[PDB]
Amino acid sequence: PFISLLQGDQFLADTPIPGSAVIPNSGNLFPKWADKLSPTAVETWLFDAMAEDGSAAFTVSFFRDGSQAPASFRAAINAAWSDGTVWSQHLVVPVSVVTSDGPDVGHGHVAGVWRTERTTASFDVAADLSTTTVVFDAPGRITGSLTHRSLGYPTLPQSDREAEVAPGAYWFRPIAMANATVDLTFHIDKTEKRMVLGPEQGAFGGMDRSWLPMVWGKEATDALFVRAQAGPYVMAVMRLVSKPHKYYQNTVNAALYRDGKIVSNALRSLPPDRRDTAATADAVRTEKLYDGDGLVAKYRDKNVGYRLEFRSAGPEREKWSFDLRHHQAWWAKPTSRPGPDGTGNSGFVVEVTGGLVGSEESVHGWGMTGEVELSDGH
């Protein structure tokens, strides 16, 4: 069994060391810093779920973050209920272990455990990526499980370029789209609250995988996470805008599906003020929305949502445009000291409208966005 076990107080490398390479056509779920963790690296395993009607949403990111040592191991959890309740906590643990069962380190049954030597948070992913299980055992905070049943959407990167969300930085989706179940109990500051999404309620989610050998905050001014479903469309986005020292490089790893077929493999992020028909490659344009309905974000950008315009370089030259409008404020935290330069990290449940450009299509759905703002820097 391949084992990456990070524990104690000597798990950090002395210098930034390289991580292992991208494995083509793989979830890449086994850690890229297997034995020692680079002090500037971050590895992320993300699992989420939301109700098909936006009545509930849940996301957890399992982190190994070298830069925030000693507290490098963390399951960051966010939960939202349609009645307005939100719940956000980190489970900071001293042990993070990931194992992959089988001879092939890129295609084995993976189990991750963020745990004390009481807090247990664990994930389990089938070797064929068909299913996941996430289990929380954190008495007095969160207990229960999340599961994914993959819908089998094409998703895996076939090359280093397809795994990138920016040069040398990786974010992609080992499971693009899954039927999600949730059966969780949260302790609200002693009161308990349930979140239950059964296997036939149309709740959906995915599994995202990321790793970076550099601290990403020093490289970006903007990060946008999206997962949304509207009618036949499923869309997932990780878009980065760099710092001004790289001239606001616009990068993305995104995908649009229609009835489970990938219709935009969007590894190109377009200038937000374009709305043209050029398409030499599949692409997505992310544009902050300020007009119309939607809760206004609180920090640097007072946006009511985001427009996502996907383009296909396929022969039909289709474009799809969706408006993702802030429906429920999920989380909101500063990413800098307050004031005129202040920035933030905001999560929303979004209402989704739109469809194929040039058609009568007008679909309706729900999703989540994570909208991160970072300082422009000296």
Ligand X SMILES: C/C=C(\C)[C@H]1C=C[C@H]2C[C@@H](C)C[C@@H](C)[C@@H]2[C@H]1/C(O)=C1\C(=O)N[C@@H](C[C@](C)(O)C(=O)O)C1=O
Which tokens go with 156?
A: 């895996």
Q: How far is the CB of 16 from ligand X (least distance, A)?
A: 16
Tell which residue, 197, 93, 186, has the closest CA to residue 143. Answer: 186
Alpha-carbon distance of 95 to 72, in angstroms, equals 9
Q: Compare residues 171 and 233 and give the one whose CB is closer to ligand X.
A: 171
59/100 with CB nearer ligand X: 59
DSSP state of 22: P
Q: How far is the CB of 331 from ligand X (least distance, A)?
A: 5
Shortest Å, Cβ 42 to ligand X = 6
Q: What DSSP letter does each residue of 55-118 carry, written as one string?
A: SEEEEEEEEEEGGGTTS-EEEEEEEEETTS-EEEEEEE-SEEEEEEESS-TTSSEEEEEEE---
Q: Please, what is the minimum distance in Å from the beta carbon of residue 335 to ligand X?
A: 9
Cβ closest to ligand X, residue 60 vs residue 129? 60
Nearer to ligand X, 60 or 263 (CB): 60
Of 19, 58, 82, 51, nearest to 136 by C-alpha is: 58
| Cα atoms in the 13 Å half-sphere on the side-chain side of 10 | 0
* Contact yes or no for 37/72 (Cβ under 8 A): yes
Cβ atoms < 10 Å from Cβ of 13: 16
Q: Cβ-closest residue to ligand X?
A: 370
Least distance to ligand X from the beta carbon of 365, Å?
Answer: 18
Q: Closest distance between ligand X and the C-beta of residue 219, in Å?
A: 8
Q: Which residue has the tokens 């004390």?
A: 116
Residue 156 vs 165, nearer CB to ligand X: 165
Cβ nearer to ligand X, comparing 87 with 258: 87
Which residue reads 């469809």 in tokens? Answer: 355
Q: Report strand pairing: 269-270 vs 283-289.
A: parallel
- Footprint on this chain of ligand X (rule: CB under 6 A): 44, 46, 59, 61, 76, 78, 88, 165, 169, 171, 210, 212, 216, 223, 225, 331, 345, 347, 370, 372
- Name the minimum Å distance from CB 102 to ligand X: 27
Closest by CA position to 287, among listed 361, 237, 333, 234: 237
Nearer to ligand X, 308 or 356 (CB): 308
